[PDB]
Design an enzyme around this catalytic site. Structure first.
Site, PDB file in Angstrom:
ATOM      1  N   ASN A 186       0.854  -1.226   0.000  1.00  0.00           N
ATOM      2  CA  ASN A 186       0.000   0.000   0.000  1.00  0.00           C
ATOM      3  C   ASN A 186       0.871   1.252   0.000  1.00  0.00           C
ATOM      4  O   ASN A 186       0.360   2.313   0.271  1.00  0.00           O
ATOM      5  CB  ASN A 186      -0.994   0.029   1.155  1.00  0.00           C
ATOM      6  CG  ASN A 186      -1.743  -1.281   1.339  1.00  0.00           C
ATOM      7  OD1 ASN A 186      -1.802  -1.805   2.449  1.00  0.00           O
ATOM      8  ND2 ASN A 186      -2.316  -1.809   0.267  1.00  0.00           N
ATOM      9  N   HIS A 188       3.325   2.384   1.793  1.00  0.00           N
ATOM     10  CA  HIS A 188       3.787   2.917   3.110  1.00  0.00           C
ATOM     11  C   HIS A 188       5.129   2.257   3.458  1.00  0.00           C
ATOM     12  O   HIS A 188       5.333   1.077   3.031  1.00  0.00           O
ATOM     13  CB  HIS A 188       2.759   2.667   4.224  1.00  0.00           C
ATOM     14  CG  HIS A 188       1.418   3.188   3.876  1.00  0.00           C
ATOM     15  ND1 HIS A 188       1.212   4.510   3.611  1.00  0.00           N
ATOM     16  CD2 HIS A 188       0.255   2.556   3.598  1.00  0.00           C
ATOM     17  CE1 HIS A 188      -0.044   4.693   3.231  1.00  0.00           C
ATOM     18  NE2 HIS A 188      -0.646   3.511   3.197  1.00  0.00           N
ATOM     19  N   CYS A 223       7.201   7.675   8.355  1.00  0.00           N
ATOM     20  CA  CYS A 223       8.055   8.361   7.369  1.00  0.00           C
ATOM     21  C   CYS A 223       7.392   8.135   5.992  1.00  0.00           C
ATOM     22  O   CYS A 223       7.088   6.961   5.601  1.00  0.00           O
ATOM     23  CB  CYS A 223       9.472   7.842   7.483  1.00  0.00           C
ATOM     24  SG  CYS A 223      10.523   8.269   6.080  1.00  0.00           S
TER      25      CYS A 223
END
Ligand SMILES: CNS(=O)(=O)c1cccc(C)c1F
Ligand SMILES: CNS(=O)(=O)c1cccc(C)c1F
Lengths: 264, 265
Positions: A186, A188, A223
């Site tokens: 996804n 991330h 992050c």
């Protein structure tokens, strides 16, 4: 891997691969952490989840890691079989807990254990939620009813408060950036990347002379793909360290942690 | 995995993991490259190699990758079983070739294929050299005698010459550095890291809308643990092609060059 007889835990075997080992020809703590996640995912898939549950997918809620604690007594060698058992537990409104035990498949000896604390959060707003009034009865049927703890000892390392490292750090690695291999499906940054970034400010001399026995990491903020991270370490001691990851510019905190190392 | 009946090749099955897949929910080309390296390692072990011979360990010689060429028709999905067969062939004094075929374990269909050229290097001096008949004899038994090619095509992309990208690059990713997870067990940067560095300068829009069909990569020099790399890409074209260059961010010393081919999803 398979659900156990009682359907309340999941077990899987892995053969340690050539590219998964470090300079001692045993698995890195990053390889371990990746296996913990893989067996977590196969547990979820086995009981109909994914770790989204119907009413979570409805209100756009996800489980996100607050905390990871791993203790390794022996790192499996290249070509060894490690067996990992995993189970989840409710901790009421706080969130959910996923624990792991790692064994030498041959000796049946415990070579490590891990625990992690997860919290809800809306995916869109990223606002921390409390476990629904009760409607989160969807998953209690899949957890043991009586407490099962990889870390049973009252007041144990896995639950200790971590303080904020103070400038100046003894050591630093700056300008760390994620590449596409560091993203999940996804897009991330993978939870395991942060472990690798925390360990990059440990001096090479320590990594050469010591083995990592314990790592505890708090996840404060994620992050993004185009963020840049600095990794800070100070000796606080066996060797012990305090860790801080923060965004390269404004110094916004993304993680803090401690590690403990034993002489080889 | 196991040696085949004739012990001239090696087969292994892998279940694709949650963390090994991209945005398509299929295996990245980096996961695939890592599986090729793993099955290559298990073949070496299966015949009592390190991939050094006795004579090589004596003369302090290693195999290093000059070239890697991968073609993927279908990336295996998360939880799919992929079967990989690998074998080696002597290319006389030039070096050795390792080849791979990837299949859907279920359908038995060929979903990918790869070939690589390996050359001999003195560990310490880093000096390439021709293979010696003494070394050759020690491993030629473990290779098929009649040519077995993953890329039979009379004119195959796997052997085509790669030119040097011209400044200015159309695209770039600056300041790429290896971390410890990018090192192998001997503390050299993993060959697969360079693949990921080459792909970092492809724009996100191509990656979101296209799938990588082919990658060819030449390995010129090793990036060291404390080096910093720049990645440069220029479009050279329904199918997008790119020319690639990796070079040290200081002096601009070349570490790799390559080409990729992408097809619209
Ligand atoms: C991760 N946390 S969970 O989604 O609440 C959960 C609880 C119990 C069992 C499983 C498989 C599960 F995924
Ligand atoms: C890379 N080439 S090799 O190491 O010389 C070799 C030749 C034949 C068979 C095996 C397993 C092998 F490793």
């Amino acid at each position: 891997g398979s659900l156990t007889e009682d359907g309340l835990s999941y077990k899987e075997k892995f053969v340690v691969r050539s590219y998964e080992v470090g300079s001692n020809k045993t698995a890195t703590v990053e390889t371990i952490a990746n296996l913990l996640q893989e067996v977590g995912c196969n547990h979820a898939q086995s009981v109909g989840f994914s770790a989204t549950t119907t009413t979570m997918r409805k209100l756009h809620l996800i489980w996100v890691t607050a905390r990871m604690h791993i203790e390794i007594y022996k790192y499996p060698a290249w070509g060894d079989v490690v067996e990992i058992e995993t189970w989840c537990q409710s901790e009421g409104r706080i969130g959910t807990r996923r624990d792991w035990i790692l064994k030498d498949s041959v000796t049946g000896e415990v070579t490590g254990r891990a625990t992690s604390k997860w919290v809800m959060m809306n995916q869109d707003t990223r606002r921390l939620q409390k476990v629904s009034d009760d409607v989160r009865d969807e998953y209690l049927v899949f957890c043991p009813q009586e407490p099962r703890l990889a870390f049973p000892e009252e007041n144990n390392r896995s639950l200790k408060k971590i303080p904020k490292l103070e400038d100046p750090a003894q050591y630093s690695m700056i300008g760390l950036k994620p590449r596409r291999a560091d993203l999940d499906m996804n897009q991330h940054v993978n939870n395991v990347t942060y472990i690798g970034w925390v360990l990059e400010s440990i001096p090479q001399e320590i990594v050469d002379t010591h083995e990592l026995q314990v790592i505890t990491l708090d996840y404060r903020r994620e992050c993004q793909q185009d963020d840049v991270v600095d990794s800070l370490t100070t000796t606080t001691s066996d060797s012990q360290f305090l860790h801080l990851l923060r965004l390269s510019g404004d110094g916004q905190e993304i993680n803090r942690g401690t590690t403990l190392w034993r002489k080889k």
